[PDB]
Design a protein around this ligand. Structure first.
Ligand SMILES: O=C1N[C@]2(C[C@H](C3CCC3)C2)C(=O)N1c1cncc(F)c1
Ligand SMILES: O=C1N[C@]2(C[C@H](C3CCC3)C2)C(=O)N1c1cncc(F)c1
Lengths: 305, 305
């Protein structure tokens, strides 16, 4: 028992991290098979950052301008191409530490682990969610660009995120591994609206089920609700609407605890309307939305990779 | 910017995890050089667990009774000794993936990463603190015993914790890697009192500095305090007394921020006496005590391994 914000074991990803240098900029790349993936903004200078012409900047670069180092060993670059906001550097050696992997574009409200890296060296691992507004609330300093987010299933790493930048609000924005930003963002040093964020309701309900499984039960009540009544409350408190597809994915947790999904919704409604009254749930004094139903089941069933 | 509960990259530890089987019990072991370390309770059966005679149980066992498996490959056990609450199995093969490592006995209030494992396979990684009462608030299910806690400094893993048991209160107890329990605990299925716990004051102060660095500064105020006045408040709220040694280790965060340690103590006083209202500090509605001053500096300075 116990419930923690748990990240995937990072070893399979640690062996893919490289340093990429172009001019004076150093950031991280991801070495899979004979390709290194990194943010295209490695090719910019401070002059460029307001609105870089990435096509013109890349035309001035040759394979030998991209310095790629995997720990102490220098890789030989034999081609380069830009795909959306990522550069793909072809190297002459396949990464012998390449795991089984997939590139995936995740949905808002899904979670993933981030391996924060500086100069191609791993610093730390943490779990976070893709917000409904396609930002992430990470921990990234100057030099962390190219750090990646991922999930692991059996022996297969699903890469879903590459870090590109910090918005002036201090939240984080990045791309899938085909270089398509999540959300409206562009790789330019400009103020950029994220637009309205919301609480991931299905995740809050999964976490309440996690709390009951761990014996934190004070918020259970004598009430029930409807999906329509609940969604009226959700809209008032800037929660995502709950759909039957959300109810369906909560089924295993409903079955385990014996608490019907709409009964757990009535508990959540009362927490939204009344607050916690200075009480905690799983060590938190607010409602936690960064655990998916899959996360809760995995942590509660002890699945390994 | 941003502040997350960050674990160390787990790859160096993942390469040391094995499965150990004695009779019908399977748990995790740690394979370093030519020794596998695991909880000695692997040799108990259900009849034994109220008060095992570990000396008599281990006498009934021979080298060939300890099945040690690293992924698919079987290790040959050529010796066995019990050291306190750990078993040490000498194997005929040095682990080729052994990192540079140390065994260290940590102090209460220190933090470490836990690699939670089942059947010798890594499940997840999280950060946590050794509580002042020598428990840990982890996430561990049946089969997680032998999971380890560690810190990394440069290329060196310092192993500080091996998981042994869940107390009836659902908090966790375990040993250093010499098999000495943290706290008063014994490897017996008995109700066992954990001391009174306290909040780790020096860590809360470190986290308030982390909050200012990240620009959450609403809790800063016009007040100051003294070490004696603060410590009268600390005792009323079951906070550890703050010592000059604590003030000294906050020195770098005081210098970085220009906020005198006793000013930061007067912010914490007001938070203890008034609560947060319904505001948050680094995404938390309570005062966080699982970041050390060292942790905050590392995360705020971007140190790698
Ligand atoms: O290291 C960089 N450099 C850019 C990328 C660059 C902008 C202008 C082209 C896109 C400015 C950035 O946003 N960060 C950063 C990221 N994450 C946390 C941080 F603290 C900084
Ligand atoms: O898997 C075991 N088995 C014992 C060890 C064993 C006690 C009685 C001899 C020492 C009973 C245990 O406490 N757990 C466990 C640990 N952590 C989280 C869990 F949910 C269970």
């Amino acid at each position: 028992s116990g419930f923690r914000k748990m990240a995937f074991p990072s070893g399979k990803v640690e062996g893919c991290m490289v340093q990429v240098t172009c001019g004076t900029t150093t950031l991280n790349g991801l070495w899979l098979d004979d390709v290194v993936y990194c943010p295209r903004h490695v090719i910019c200078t401070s002059e460029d950052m307001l609105n870089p012409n990435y096509e013109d900047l890349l035309i001035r670069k040759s394979n030998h301008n991209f310095l790629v180092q995997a720990g102490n060993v220098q890789l030989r670059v034999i081609g380069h191409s830009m795909q959306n906001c990522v550069l793909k550097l072809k190297v002459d050696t396949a990464n012998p530490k390449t795991p089984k992997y997939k590139f995936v574009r995740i949905q808002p409200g899904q979670t993933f682990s981030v391996l924060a890296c500086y100069n191609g060296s791993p610093s730390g691992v943490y779990q976070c969610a893709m917000r409904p507004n396609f930002t992430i609330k990470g921990s990234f300093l100057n030099g962390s660009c190219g750090s990646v987010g991922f999930n692991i299933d059996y022996d297969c790493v699903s890469f879903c995120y590459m870090h590109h930048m910090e918005l002036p609000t201090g939240v984080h924005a990045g791309t899938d591994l085909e270089g398509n930003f999540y959300g409206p963002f562009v790789d330019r040093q400009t103020a950029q609206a994220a637009g309205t964020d919301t609480t991931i309701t299905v995740n809050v309900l999964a976490w309440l089920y996690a709390a009951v499984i761990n014996g934190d039960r004070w918020f259970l009540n004598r009430f029930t609700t409807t999906l329509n009544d609940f969604n009226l409350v959700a809209m008032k408190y800037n929660y995502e609407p709950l759909t039957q597809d959300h109810v369906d994915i909560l089924g295993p947790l409903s079955a385990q605890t014996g608490i019907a999904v709409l009964d757990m919704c009535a508990s959540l409604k009362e927490l939204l309307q009344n607050g916690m009254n200075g009480r905690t749930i799983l060590g938190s004094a607010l409602l936690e939305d960064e655990f998916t139903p899959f996360d809760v089941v995995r942590q509660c069933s002890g699945v390994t990779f």
